[PDB]
Design a protein around this nucleic acid. Structure first.
Lengths: 362, 165, 178
RNA sequence: UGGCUUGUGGCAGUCAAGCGUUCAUAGCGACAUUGCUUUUUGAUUCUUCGAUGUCGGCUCUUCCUAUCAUACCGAAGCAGAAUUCGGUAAGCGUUGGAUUGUUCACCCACUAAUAGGGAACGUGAGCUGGGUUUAGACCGUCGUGAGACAGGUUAGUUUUACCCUACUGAUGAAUGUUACCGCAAUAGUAAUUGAACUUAGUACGAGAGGAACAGUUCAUUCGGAUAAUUGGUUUUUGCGGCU
RNA sequence: UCCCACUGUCCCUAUCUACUAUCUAGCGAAACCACAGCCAAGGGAACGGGCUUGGCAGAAUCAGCGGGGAAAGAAGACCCU
RNA sequence: UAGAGUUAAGGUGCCGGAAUACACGCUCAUCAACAAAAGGUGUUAGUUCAUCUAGACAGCCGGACGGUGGCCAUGGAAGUCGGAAUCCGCUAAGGAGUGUGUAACAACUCACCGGCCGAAUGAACUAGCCCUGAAAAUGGAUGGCGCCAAGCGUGUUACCUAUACUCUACCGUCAGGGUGCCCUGACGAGUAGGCAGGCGUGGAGGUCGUGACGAAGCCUGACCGUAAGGUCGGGUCGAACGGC
RNA sequence: GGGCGAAAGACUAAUCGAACCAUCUAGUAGCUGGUUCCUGCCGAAGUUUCCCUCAGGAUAGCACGAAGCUCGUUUUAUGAG
RNA sequence: CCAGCAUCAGUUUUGGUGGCAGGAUAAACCCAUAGGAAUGUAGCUUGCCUCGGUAAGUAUUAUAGCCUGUGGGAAUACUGC
C-alpha cells in the first residue's frame, strides 16, 4: 500500500462543471471593518492584457524603482443594477428574512432573463420581470429588522447591464451579492441609498488593496492522468502503457479513498486564485497596447485594430496586476480580499511610464 | 540460547564416567574462594541462595557469577572473610541439538529422527534445596556476601529465595 | 417520556434511557453538553471521540462518520447502545432524538424528579474528570452563541413558566396569607 | 508459502568490579545475564500440486516513528565559537555521479544536509524482461559406458476485450413550486530550505576567529492561476523552387 | 573499448493533423448458466462483502480505468509415484 | 414426544431478561487489561526493639579549645597517606575527628556536642492496597455507551437458570400370565452391517367386472395421515383396462 | 525399425521418436471418481501375530446377524517396585 | 383421537405464609435477691500555678463492672399442625 509523491492538486474533488457562466463563492470575503459601506465582490468581463512598464512596490529592493515589466488583466466593470435589497435577518430556525426593498426602475435586459425558459429544466412559475412591488412600506421596516436582535447580514439581488461592454446580448446575468460595511446596522442604512437603481464600483474596490481572482476556468478536455494529475510517460513507450498510469488501488485493503489517479474533467469550476494585487482603476480610456512581436497572443487593447473575439474597449475598467480565469468573451466575478497582506499603497496613483501601440501581428 | 533458554530440564540425566564417548571442556576455574580453610570455623554465619525452582545452572553462568565475585573480592582483600563455594558439578553433559535440517541439505541432518542431542555444552543441576553459591561469611562487622548475592543470582536464571543458614 | 440531561454523568443516564426506549417509547433527552464523562486531559486527549487523533478523521468512502461537537456525542452514543441491527432496534433509535440546549421552557423530569444513580458525589472519589462542554472546544466547536446561546433560549422558556406562572404564584401566596 | 519458537542472534535495562590524570559509570566496561524482540540467521513437513511466475529500476495508489533535518528545552571533565550528550515532538524537507548484474562491496564532487521500520517491498490483464525453472555446442571434474557434476562458458515464447467490486468524470426524480445566492452544525485542503542587502566589527579571547537580535530582498523547487514585454508551433490563409 | 561531428532516448513538454472513440441506422458474433456482492476489530477449514459485535451502505442512467476478488483456461512449470 | 414441578454449570449498570441492592473495608488510579533483574517520602495495619519529662526528635542557634604540626608512610603527608597507641587537658562538652577544601599549607564546617523549645518520635520486622521497570505500522483497538463504584475482598440476601433433574400420559419391537392379546419390565443419539416388516413399476397363469347412455389419458380440485405417494370428484376423451 | 541425411530423428496429407484407415476390441487400469425406497429392531472400529510385504490381505483384537446358556460386592493373604 | 384447552360442583398431592404445639433445650427481644470485689458521672469542699485549668478528698449526693450464695425466668435447630 505505497505512495508516490503528490503530482497535481488532490482537493478539487469532485471535478464538477461550473454550469452557470458567472462564478459563485459560498465563503464570501468577510467585512471591511473600516469602510462604512461596501460590497463583497463585483463584476467583470475578461478582455485582455498589457505590459505595464512601471516601478516596484517593494521599496528596499536591490534594483529598487527600476523599469519593471508586469502582467495586468484590464477587465471591464460596468456597475450592477439592483432588483431589491433583501433584508436577511434570523429566526430561531435559521437565516430567514422578513421583506425585501425593491427598486422602481430596473434596466432593459430584464426582458428575456427572469424565467427559466430552457429545455429539460424547471421554470419558476410566472415570477417575470418587475411590476411595482414592495418598497414603499418595506423601506422603513428594515430599520426595525435590526431591532429584532435576531438579525444577520443584509444582501442585495443584482443583475448586469450588458451592452456597454461590446457583447451585444440583452438577457442579463444574475447573482446575489453581499453588502459589507462597518456593522450590521450600517450595511442596512447606507444600502438604502444603494437600491435606487445602480451601485458604485468604487465602494467595494478601493485602489491598491488586493483582489482575489475567482472566475470560471476553461474545460480543457476529458483530460487523462498525464495532464490532469501529472504523471510522465514510460521511456520504453510501447504496448498499452504510454499515457497510462500504474496504481489506482492497493492489495491490502482493496478499498481505498478519493486520491486515485484517474481521467476526467480538468479546470472548469469556480476556482479561486489568491491575492492578485490591484494596479490601478481607469475610467474611460488611458492605457493602450499592441506591439509587433511574439510574446503571448490574441488579446490586444486598443492597437491599430481592436481585440480579437471581444470588441474594442470604450467603457470603465479596473486593472488587476495578475490575471483572472476564463478566456475571451467569458464573464467573470471579481471577489475582494478579506486578508489583505501588504499595506495599502493608495492615495496617489501608480506609475504608468510608456507603453507601445502599433499592430500586434506582422 | 541465552540462559533464559538454559532454564528448566526436559533434558533428563546422563552423567557417568563408564558410559560416555568423551565430554567437552568446562569453564570452571575454582570452587572454594576467599578462605579455603574456614568453612564453619571462622564463619558461624552463612547465606544460602536456595532455589525455588528445579533448574539447570549452565556452566556458562556458573563461572560468570563466581568470577564476578572473584574480581570484586580483591578490594576488601583477595582472601577476605568469606568462603564462596561451588557445590554441585556439571556431572551431566548438556545435550543440545543442531546442526539439524530436514530436506535440501549436505547429507540431511534430520532432527526428529536423530533425536540424540549431540553433546555441545555442560550444565549443573541446582534443584530445590540445593545451592552452588554457599557463602559462609563472618559474624560481626564485615559481612560482604549479602551484596554479593545480588551479583550471584544475576548470573543465574530463576528467582532464588535468600535463606540465612 | 421526556427527561433532561443536566448535571450528572453521561453513561449512567444513557443506560437508563435505553431500557425506556426498549419497546418504542418516545424518550427525548434534552442537553448533552451539561453531562460529564470522566478521564484525564492526557490519556483522555489524543485518543478521544472528538477531534484530536481518532474519531473525526475516521472514515473511508464506504465507511464511518463521527463528530467534533458535544451535541452529537449523545446521538452517536445511542446507536452504540441500541443498534440499527434488529427491527425494533432501528425503530427504537428513531424514538430518540437528542437536543442541544433546552428548547422546552417548561419543567418536566429534570433535577429533583429523575431516576436513580446519576448524581455522583465526589469527595474521597474524584480528582481528575472532564466535562463535555470543555473537552469540545479546540476540536472545531465554535460558534458558542449558536449552541451555547441555547442556554439563552432555555432562559426564555423558564420565563414563560415564571409568568403566567408568577401570576398563579402571587395568587397562591395571597391564598395562604389568608 | 502461511503458522509457531527465537534455535542462530540483534538491541536495551543492567549486576559493576576494573581503567581513564585523581576517579564504578566525561569516557572506556572484565564477566555476562534478565526482560523485551523478531533484524543476523533458520530449527519444523503444522498448512498447500484441476498453478504458490523471479530480481534491480521507471511510473503512480498508505500508515507508524526503533528520529537524518526543520519548532521548543536542559546539562558536561565546553573559553565565545568550534566540540560532547540527553528530554518534549510526526505537519513538512530528505541530492548529483563512478566502480560493481546490483542496494551490499567501494570511491569521489558538492550541497543547508543527504534518516529508521512495516505494509502480498503499489508492483508483469500499468512496465523493462539486463537479474530469473527445460531444449544447438565446448571446457574442467567424475564413472567400464550410454553419460554425469552443490564447477564455469555460447544461442534459446511476457497471450487477451475486467463478469462483481475499489473507482474518476456527466445527466435524470421524492412535503406546493421556484430562475438567483449568502450561513459554517460539517467534508475536502495548502506546506519546505539557502544566499544577499545587512546586523557588527560589537560580545569574548593567547591566537586563528567573530555570537545574541533586527529590518530588507530574492533564488532553487511544488500547486493553482497563466495568454502582454518573452520562446516556438498555427495542414485554416498568403508567400519561394523542380518534374 | 578509446576518438571526432552529432542525436526526442531523455531533459521538458507543448502545439497542430489524419482515423475513430462520443453518437446513430440496419442486420447480427464469441467460449460463456453459484444464493450473493462494505469496512475495522474478533473467533475460525488457518488471509470473510458472506460468520460475532460495532461503524457504514437507496433506486432510474451513461461515459471511464487497471488495485482486489484473482478474469479469458489447461486436471501446475516445481515436485514424487 | 408435549405442557407443567424443581434446579446445575453460570448471570442481574446497559446493548439484551433480572439488585443503580444490603453490611463492613484498604484504595478512586478508570485500578479493572501480560511481563523479570532491580528500585521508590503514594497510603494503611500488626509485631518486636533502640529512643522518651531520667527532656524523644527537627529547625534555628554555637564551643570550633590547651598539649600541637601528637606520632609515623614519603620526594613531601600536613587531623586531612598508611598504621597503631588510644589519651591527657579543663574532669557540668570537643573525639587524637562527621563532612568540605587547596599538590599541601592556605582555608572551612560539624555528628561527637552545645543552647532555645516541650511530645510521642524513630529504626527494624511482617502484611496489604499502590507504584517504577514495558516500542511497530488499516478506523475505537486492552469493551459500544462508558463506570471513581456500575471496580475488588469478606460476610449476607433477593431475583434468573439444561428435552437432564421431575410429574403423569402417549409412540417402537419382544418376554411372562390367558386367548383374541392384554397386563407391562428395561432401554430406546446414530454412520457401516445383518435380519424383519411395509409401500413400488413392466409382465402373467387368471378374468370375471367396468365401457362409447362416455375407457385409458390430458388438465384441475378435494385430499385420509407413520416415512413411503393413492382413492374420490369436476371440466373433458371415443377405446381401453382392475373384483378374484 | 524400412525409405533418408552436409546431422536437425528435419522428412512423409497439418498426425512422422516408426504415416494413415479398418478389424480382433466393449484390450486392460493392482489406482482414482460416480452410483436410485422408508421406518424399526439395532450398531462397532482405526488394534495385532505376520509378509520380496506396504493406499492391500491370511490371522488375531472388538461389537454385526441367529439359536442354546453364562455377574459381583469384597474378605483372607501371597508376589513384585 | 393424542397434546394445548373446556361448563359447573366436590376432593387429593406438594410447598409456603400465618396462627399454634410436641420432641428436646435455655440462651433471651431480655428476667429476682443477698454479700463481697469494683470505679463512672454529676455536684460540693480544699490546695497550688495561671487566666486558663488541674490535683486531692468526696463510702457522708448518685450509680456500675466480676465472683459467690439463694431464688426465679426461659418458643423451639429438628418435627408436626
Amino acid at each position: 500500500k505505497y505512495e508516490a509523491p503528490r503530482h497535481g492538486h488532490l482537493g478539487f474533488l469532485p471535478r464538477k462543471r461550473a454550469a452557470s457562466i458567472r462564478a459563485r463563492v459560498k465563503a464570501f470575503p468577510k467585512d471591511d471593518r473600516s469602510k462604512p459601506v461596501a460590497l463583497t465582490s463585483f463584476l467583470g468581463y475578461k478582455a485582455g492584457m498589457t505590459t505595464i512598464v512601471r516601478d516596484l512596490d517593494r521599496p528596499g529592493s536591490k534594483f529598487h524603482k527600476r523599469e519593471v515589466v508586469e502582467a495586468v488583466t484590464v477587465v471591464d466593470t460596468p456597475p450592477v443594477v439592483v432588483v431589491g435589497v433583501v433584508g436577511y435577518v434570523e429566526t430561531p430556525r435559521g437565516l430567514r428574512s422578513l421583506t425585501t426593498v425593491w427598486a422602481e426602475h430596473l434596466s432593459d435586459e430584464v426582458k428575456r432573463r427572469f424565467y427559466k425558459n430552457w429545455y429539460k429544466s424547471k421554470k419558476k412559475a410566472f415570477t417575470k420581470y418587475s411590476a411595482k412591488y414592495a418598497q414603499d412600506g418595506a423601506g422603513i421596516e428594515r430599520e426595525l429588522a435590526r431591532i429584532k436582535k435576531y438579525a444577520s447580514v443584509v444582501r442585495v439581488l443584482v443583475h448586469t447591464q450588458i451592452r456597454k461592454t461590446p457583447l451585444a446580448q440583452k438577457k442579463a446575468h444574475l447573482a446575489e451579492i453581499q453588502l459589507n460595511g462597518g456593522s450590521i446596522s450600517e450595511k442596512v442604512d447606507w444600502a438604502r441609498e444603494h437600491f435606487e437603481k445602480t451601485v458604485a464600483v468604487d465602494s467595494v474596490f478601493e485602489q491598491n488593496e488586493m483582489i482575489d481572482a475567482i472566475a470560471v476556468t476553461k474545460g480543457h478536455g476529458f483530460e487523462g492522468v498525464t495532464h490532469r494529475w501529472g504523471t510522465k510517460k514510460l521511456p520504453r513507450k510501447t504496448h498499452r502503457g504510454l499515457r497510462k498510469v500504474a496504481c489506482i488501488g492497493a492489495w491490502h485493503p482493496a478499498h481505498v479513498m478519493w486520491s486515485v489517479a484517474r481521467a476526467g474533467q480538468r479546470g472548469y469550476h469556480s476556482r479561486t486564485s489568491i491575492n492578485h494585487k490591484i494596479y490601478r482603476v481607469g475610467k474611460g480610456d488611458d492605457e493602450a497596447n499592441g506591439a509587433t512581436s511574439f510574446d503571448r497572443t490574441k488579446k490586444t487593447i486598443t492597437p491599430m485594430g481592436g481585440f480579437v473575439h471581444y470588441g474594442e474597449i470604450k467603457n470603465d475598467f479596473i486593472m488587476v496586476k495578475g490575471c483572472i480565469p476564463g478566456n475571451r468573451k467569458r464573464i467573470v466575478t471579481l471577489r475582494k480580499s478579506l486578508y489583505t497582506n501588504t499595506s495599502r499603497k493608495a492615495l496617489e496613483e501608480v506609475s504608468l511610464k510608456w507603453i507601445d501601440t502599433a499592430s500586434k501581428f506582422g | 540460547r541465552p540462559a533464559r533458554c538454559y532454564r528448566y530440564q526436559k533434558n533428563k540425566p546422563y552423567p557417568k564416567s563408564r558410559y560416555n564417548r568423551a565430554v567437552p571442556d568446562s569453564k570452571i576455574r575454582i570452587y572454594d574462594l576467599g578462605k579455603k580453610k574456614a568453612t564453619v570455623d571462622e564463619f558461624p554465619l552463612c547465606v544460602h541462595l536456595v532455589s525455588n525452582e528445579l533448574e539447570q545452572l549452565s556452566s556458562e553462568a556458573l563461572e560468570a557469577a563466581r568470577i564476578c565475585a572473584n574480581k570484586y573480592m580483591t578490594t576488601v582483600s583477595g582472601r577476605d572473610a568469606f568462603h564462596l563455594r561451588v557445590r554441585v558439578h556439571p556431572f551431566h553433559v548438556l545435550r543440545i541439538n543442531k546442526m539439524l535440517s530436514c530436506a535440501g541439505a549436505d547429507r540431511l541432518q534430520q532432527g526428529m529422527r536423530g533425536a540424540w542431542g549431540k553433546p555441545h555444552g555442560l550444565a549443573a543441576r541446582v534443584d530445590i534445596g540445593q545451592i552452588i553459591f554457599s557463602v559462609r561469611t563472618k559474624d560481626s562487622n564485615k559481612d560482604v556476601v549479602v551484596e554479593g548475592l545480588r551479583r550471584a543470582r544475576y548470573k543465574f536464571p530463576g528467582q532464588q529465595k535468600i535463606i540465612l543458614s | 417520556v421526556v427527561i433532561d440531561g443536566k448535571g450528572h454523568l453521561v453513561g449512567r443516564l444513557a443506560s437508563v434511557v435505553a431500557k425506556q426506549l426498549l419497546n418504542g417509547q418516545k424518550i427525548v433527552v434534552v442537553r448533552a453538553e451539561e453531562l460529564n464523562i470522566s478521564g484525564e486531559f492526557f490519556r483522555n486527549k489524543l485518543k478521544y471521540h472528538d477531534f484530536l487523533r481518532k474519531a473525526t478523521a475516521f472514515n473511508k468512502t464506504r465507511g464511518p462518520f463521527h463528530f467534533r461537537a458535544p451535541s452529537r456525542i449523545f446521538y452517536k452514543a445511542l446507536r452504540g447502545m441500541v443498534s440499527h441491527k434488529t427491527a425494533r432496534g432501528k425503530a427504537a433509535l428513531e424514538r430518540l432524538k437528542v437536543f442541544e440546549g433546552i428548547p422546552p421552557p417548561y419543567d418536566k423530569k429534570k433535577r429533583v424528579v429523575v431516576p436513580q444513580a446519576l448524581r455522583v458525589l465526589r469527595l474521597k472519589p474524584g480528582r481528575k474528570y472532564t466535562t463535555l462542554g470543555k473537552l469540545s472546544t479546540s476540536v472545531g466547536w465554535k460558534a458558542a452563541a449558536a449552541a451555547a446561546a441555547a442556554a439563552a433560549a432555555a432562559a426564555a422558556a423558564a420565563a414563560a413558566a415564571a409568568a403566567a406562572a408568577a401570576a398563579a404564584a402571587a395568587a397562591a401566596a395571597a391564598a395562604a396569607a389568608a
